[PDB]
Amino acid sequence: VFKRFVEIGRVAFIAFGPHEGKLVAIVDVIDQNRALVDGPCTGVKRQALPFKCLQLTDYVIKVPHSARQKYVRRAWEKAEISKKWEESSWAKKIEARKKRAAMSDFDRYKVSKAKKMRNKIIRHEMKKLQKAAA
């Protein structure tokens, strides 16, 4: 049933906390509630972040447990996790949400006249296909 496990090397996304929004690599599992994550290519020093802050992604790297960040960095670049991440949808939803939150008042005006016209074009085509289907 499960497809994402907490294993040595599982790239996890930090949901909240100090390093909110940055990826880490689970290097070792301390307890049931904590893990020894280390993101060498993202900007997160090695520390004990709890599983409450982590969100498991679909990327695993080949690193032994409790290895230095020198070897974690090698497997992070060999599996090109940063390249696979930036081109994913969950990373593009974050990028799209940051754009909308930084919209000015002039941007909310230009974005309103667009969807007001874009929806009228689609809603006209929807009724055109609906009448023909009847």
Binding site: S89, K92, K93, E95, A96, R97, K98, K99, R100, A101, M103, D107, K110, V111, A114, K115, M117, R118, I121, I122, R123, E125, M126, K128, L129, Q130, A133
Partner: protein, 204 residues
């Protein structure tokens, strides 16, 4: 939601009795109008035999000299939840009595509300507040075994409400399927209007 809406229609299925009433009682004091539907779907923590004993012990609190004035033990799940909210309000005052008038409870979803979107309070749900290994008691079965006589008719009218909404959702799906097909057939004509949505993060 969370927008000071005119009428907050909260669904009752899956929610906990005291967890939902503690939030509903606070919204009615702020001036909002809450409409809790499907009060027979509310469930209480603890196994069924505990929650039934808690209500059977409530049936014994009648006044000795004249039970006609004693505690009115309502058997309807809506009136059971309505009294739970009343215990969390200063109903002896005027602001507490006016807050009860803002709350309207129903057993099932009546026609005035079967064509409305029902909200869900995640801070009062069973999956969020109770462990999966714990026992719970449904207020519908609890009410039926203490004197509620309208459980079968509510379940029969709820089945007609579901089969009448399933026919519309099948028409809502076939209308959205044409909307997705409409965008593919007109994508060459809305490319200028969709890029500004892509530029400002409206469309991912």
């Amino acid at each position: 939601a969370d927008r000071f809406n005119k009428v907050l229609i909260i669904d009752g299925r899956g929610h906990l009795l005291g967890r939902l009433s503690a939030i509903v009682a606070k919204q009615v004091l702020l001036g909002h109008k809450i409409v809790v539907v499907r009060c027979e779907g509310i469930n209480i923590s603890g196994n069924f035999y505990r929650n039934k004993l808690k209500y059977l012990a409530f049936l014994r609190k009648r006044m000795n000299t004249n039970p006609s004035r004693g505690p009115y033990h309502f058997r309807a799940p809506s009136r059971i939840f309505w009294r739970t909210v009343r215990g969390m309000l200063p109903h002896k005052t005027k602001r507490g009595q006016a807050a009860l008038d803002r709350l309207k409870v129903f057993d099932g979803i009546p026609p005035p509300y079967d064509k409305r979107k029902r909200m869900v309070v995640p801070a009062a749900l069973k999956i969020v507040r109770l462990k999966p290994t714990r026992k719970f008691a449904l207020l519908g079965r609890l009410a039926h075994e203490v004197g509620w006589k309208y459980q079968a008719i509510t379940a029969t009218l709820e089945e007609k409400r579901k089969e009448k909404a399933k026919l519309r959702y099948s028409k809502k799906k076939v209308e959205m399927k044409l909307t997705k097909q409409a965008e593919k057939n007109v994508e060459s004509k809305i490319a200028v209007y969709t890029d500004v949505l892509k530029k400002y993060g409206v469309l991912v």
